[PDB]
Ligand SMILES: Cc1cc2nc3c(=O)[nH]c(=O)nc-3n(C[C@H](O)[C@H](O)[C@H](O)COP(=O)(O)OP(=O)(O)OC[C@H]3O[C@@H](n4cnc5c(N)ncnc54)[C@H](O)[C@@H]3O)c2cc1C
Ligand SMILES: *[C@@H]1O[C@H](CO)[C@@H](O)[C@H](O)[C@H]1NC(C)=O
């Protein structure tokens with residue numbers, strides 16, 4: 001933990017090589033084009049720029065345009081803000097009926113998220129069967145952590161929840177650790193101890209400022225292709241609606257880093273995907289693959305809200321209670337009269353009048369899956385349809401039951417006892433915002449899980465390694481095309497995956513360079 005970042009202002013030095021996509025002089029040949037300046041995309045583009053000419057295209061603007069993205073205090077504002085098509089938070093509703101968000105900004109979802117930093121479960125690497133260079137993975141985590149991760153200072157509510165998890169049997173006590181392991185710990189945060197947000201856009205500062213160019217408000221609409229099928233470039237439009245082209249040259253590559261939703265969407269619009277589906281939309285099939293936009297996952301969030309009779313201090317999540325079958329945390333949150341879109345799964349949810357503890361459990365995997373399909377067959381700015389099929393797999397429901405029973409145990413701890421409105425024996429002594437925990441039968445817990453599910457926001461899949469990609473993240477059947485982002489895996493790396501996806505952008509960047517050099 002020598003390596004971690006210090007308290008520091010958000011480093012915008014990289015803006016010296018950020019340009020409006022309206023600039024036609026960005027058009028031309030590069031060694032690499034990275035689509036999506038997000039969690040994976042920014043460290044990938046920065047890494048490739050050490051040796052080669054890179055163009056990073058991001059649909060959103062720069063985070064300075066939306067100052068409430070730059071502090072812990074600002075987190076609520078960004079989810080409360082109406083989506084006018086330019087804001088850093090893009091709102092959507094799954095076909096399941098569950099409200100959700102994705103980022104639209106340079107730095108991607110690291111500019112809007114809850115700041116929690118963790119490394120992958122060390123068993124994840126062997127689970128994938130990918131031949132990881134595990135020494136390099138660990139060097140890559142330290143490169144991220146040196147730049148943007150701190151050891152969080154103590155927060156009253158997080159310490160209460162930590163004592164509660166330990167008392168409720170989420171053992172052992174792991175103290176301060178970045179590692180995803182069974183038990184209770186303080187993990188890292190991308191919010192510094194002054195409340196400054198640090199994010200994936202800062203990793204652009206590790207890029208070579210003579211090799212890296214970033215275009216913002218660059219909406220990438222199509223991947224361009226070469227009978228030896230290759231990606232050759234992209235079409236992108238600017239904020240005025242004019243079209244632009246860029247190309248890769250020589251042994252260069254296009255990498256799609258547009259997220260679980262953006263990646264499959266762009267692959268389908270470009271004619272990569274299921275043959276009968278694309279041919280049903282009269283989209284010319286460049287590469288038939290049945291799995292583009294298939295195996296899309298959203299880990300369920302289930303929760304209760306308690307309203308302590310004395311105010312609690314608002315906190316960012318730093319304390320985690322991990323078991324193999326559920327991952328638990330709690331935020332303490334100020335009251336509001338404008339809802340945080342997707343905090344609760346629909347717009348019809350009570351507003352809190354006082355400070356509340358949002359106490360949550362995450363279902364691992366999950367095993368339930370759905371898909372991304374096109375709404376428009378031409379317009380990338382029209383959000384695709386996304387369905388997660390929450391609790392379609394009975395294992396997921398069984399795991400939520402275990403998690404909700406454990407939150408029951410948590411509300412019974414001496415740790416939490418001071419936060420009750422009534423000094424009675426039962427957890428009905430708490431005041432609840434919304435639905436409280438339900439008897440000695442699983443069926444009431446099942447109904448609670450099914451009825452009150454929300455998004456954890458850690459959705460993943462749609463371009464899986466083993467289905468769309470090979471073990472080098474290449475799109476099977478296409479040269480000079482890769483995918484690096486959360487679309488690539490069908491299970492979580494851990495409870496809080498930003499750490500893994502930040503590492504993955506640089507790691508795959510280093511594998512591309514090593515491949516090159518031979
Ligand atoms: C509200 C919220 C809170 C979260 N909290 C945490 C947490 O505390 N800790 C944690 O570990 N994880 C958290 N997560 C999850 C984690 O942040 C994400 O899973 C991860 O950041 C995803 O990275 P990505 O690179 O796949 O996508 P992104 O970071 O979203 O990057 C994709 C980028 O592509 C851009 N893009 C999309 N389509 C196009 C296109 N056609 N042309 C150009 N650009 C395009 C997008 O604007 C975006 O910048 C949270 C998620 C959300 C939504
Ligand atoms: C890009 O230029 C247009 C004017 O042509 C302007 O409306 C837009 O806000 C600019 N975007 C950025 C990110 O500077």
Ligand SMILES: *[C@@H]1O[C@H](CO)[C@@H](O)[C@H](O)[C@H]1NC(C)=O
Pocket residue numbers: 119122134135138179
């Ligand atoms: C990588 O770091 C983890 C701690 O996150 C450690 O458990 C593991 O042994 C390291 N692996 C290697 C190959 O050094």
Ligand SMILES: *[C@@H]1O[C@H](CO)[C@@H](O)[C@H](O)[C@H]1NC(C)=O
Pocket residue numbers: 153154155159
């Ligand atoms: C800071 O955080 C935790 C809370 O108990 C603990 O590690 C440490 O003793 C605390 N120090 C304080 C409150 O000064």
Ligand SMILES: *[C@@H]1O[C@H](CO)[C@@H](O)[C@H](O)[C@H]1NC(C)=O
Pocket residue numbers: 121122123124127180181182322323324
């Ligand atoms: C870590 O990953 C492996 C599955 O790959 C799993 O068996 C184990 O339960 C996970 N542990 C936790 C605590 O999530």
Ligand SMILES: *[C@@H]1O[C@H](CO)[C@@H](O)[C@H](O)[C@H]1NC(C)=O
Pocket residue numbers: 374375376385
């Ligand atoms: C597009 O999304 C809308 C919601 O605006 C949905 O109701 C409509 O039927 C969808 N169209 C297609 C082609 O999926």
Ligand SMILES: *[C@@H]1O[C@H](CO)[C@@H](O)[C@H](O)[C@H]1NC(C)=O
Pocket residue numbers: 367368392393394395
């Ligand atoms: C749930 O998940 C696995 C796929 O991972 C599958 O084997 C099982 O049949 C699925 N559905 C169930 C058990 O309802």
